[PDB]
């Protein structure tokens, strides 16, 4: 429940200010950044601050502090979900969102603040429908704005009828220093790119375990979705009954669903690294990278980020296949391999020096994160079975999909 949502910069001056209740004074914003200087430098940083009775809900963009202020017991997730939405809608309008995006385009942005929220109550936040009466270039509001279907306007027409799906895997991994997998879940996310005519109701079916269990095909290949979070447009009451992915999509690119599942099978690529940290002297990383995944599959453009010490110096790299760049700016090495097929196992032998004087303070142990990408490859084994195009006009669309497996949080805790 917002009263005054503000946008600050890295200095703390107001990029744009907008109140919704008047219950928070407009000059309260000048205490936030010193309290932000306070809480951070004592490590008491929270996304909510408090100068007396004014509560400072804020997120942080590249430059920006979307500070939403309130005083009462406001609904908190109501605030921040709107905060990332305003970032999103600005990202929908302004291809980069910085200080240039605000001060040059205050014509539209104040109008967005008038439109997205009244009183602290977000009422219209779908940017695609918002484009139709809030332009930076005014007519009546659309019926889709009035309509319960609030994501897809009628009369959308294309020459072709293309449904572009992107079943994207994101492998999380937590391997400790012991070499055991602590947490390796997979958060996959199907993101749709719809180019369709009119108002279609798309009905999707996958190799769901429960839907195959309801069918009686719970012995064949069936992915087990531990939880999915869907779009609004999915009629979840229809899905709650019988695993039915039925929806009217919006037009264009959108993530429909967000599935999450655990997987007790091996990581696609196992890393073995060593550290010969010689005191005052040097360090050595004889790191290998074996691919456990399928040999037909190839891990594209992998980027193995191994955290090196800060005052590490004189780099030497005995690779096998793939180049190293040493990034002292991140105090690390990126042993990059472009093409790395399954079954392959490439070593890299790193060698730095170390100053004969010690440093003053500790550094801590960041894990190793790599940046693999494997196309045409569902590690969880999810398969889209069909996509029912249902139009009252009636057409034969072109449904299309590609499979891409990337990392989620691919952290492997170092020595």
């Amino acid at each position: 429940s917002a009263s005054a949502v503000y946008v600050l910069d890295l200095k703390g001056k107001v990029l744009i200010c907008r109140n919704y209740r008047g219950d928070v004074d407009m000059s309260e914003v000048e205490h936030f950044m010193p309290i932000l200087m306070e809480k951070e430098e004592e490590g008491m940083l929270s996304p909510i601050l408090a100068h007396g009775g004014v509560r400072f809900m804020w997120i942080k963009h590249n430059n920006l502090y979307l500070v939403a202020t309130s005083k009462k017991n406001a609904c908190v997730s109501l605030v921040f979900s709107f905060l990332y939405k305003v970032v999103q809608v600005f990202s929908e309008y302004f291809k980069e969102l910085e200080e240039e995006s605000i001060r040059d385009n205050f014509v539209i942005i104040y109008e967005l603040l008038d439109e997205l929220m009244d009183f602290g109550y977000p009422q219209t936040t779908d940017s695609k429908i918002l484009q139709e009466y809030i332009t930076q270039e005014a007519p009546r509001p659309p019926a889709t704005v009035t309509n319960a279907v609030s994501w897809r306007s009628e009369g959308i027409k294309y020459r072709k009828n293309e449904v572009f799906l992107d079943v994207i895997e994101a492998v999380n991994l937590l391997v400790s220093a012991n070499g055991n997998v602590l947490r390796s879940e997979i958060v996959g996310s199907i993101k749709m790119r719809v180019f369709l005519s009119g108002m279609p109701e798309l009905r999707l079916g996958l190799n769901d375990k429960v839907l195959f269990d309801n069918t009686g095909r719970g012995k064949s290949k069936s992915v087990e979705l531990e939880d999915v979070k869907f779009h609004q447009c999915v009629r979840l009451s229809r899905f709650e009954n019988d695993r039915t992915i039925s929806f009217i999509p919006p037009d264009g690119e959108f993530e429909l669903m967000s599935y999450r599942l655990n997987t007790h099978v091996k990581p696609l690529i196992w890393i073995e690294s060593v550290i010969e940290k010689h005191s005052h002297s040097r360090i050595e990383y004889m790191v290998k990278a074996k691919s456990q995944f399928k040999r037909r599959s190839t891990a594209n453009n992998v980027e193995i980020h191994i955290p090196v010490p800060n005052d590490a110096d004189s780099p030497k790299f005995k690779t096998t296949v793939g180049s190293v760049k040493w990034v002292p700016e991140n105090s690390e090495i990126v042993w990059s391999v472009k093409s790395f097929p399954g079954g392959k196992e490439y070593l890299m032998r790193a060698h730095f020096g170390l100053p004969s004087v010690e440093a003053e303070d500790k550094e801590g142990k960041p894990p190793i994160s790599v940046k693999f990408e494997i196309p045409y490859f569902t590690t969880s084994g999810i398969q889209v079975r069909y996509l029912k195009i249902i139009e009252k006009s009636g057409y034969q669309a072109l449904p299309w999909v590609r499979y891409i497996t990337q990392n989620g949080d691919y952290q492997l805790r170092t020595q």
Binding site: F164, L165, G205, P375, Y376, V384, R385, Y386, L387, K388, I389, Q396, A397, L398, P399, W400, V401, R402, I404
Partner: peptide, 13 residues
């Protein structure tokens, strides 16, 4: 998008 697409069925009756 340098990767290419693959067409699914429509009905799967």
């Amino acid at each position: 998008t340098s990767y290419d697409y693959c067409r699914v069925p429509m009905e799967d009756g």
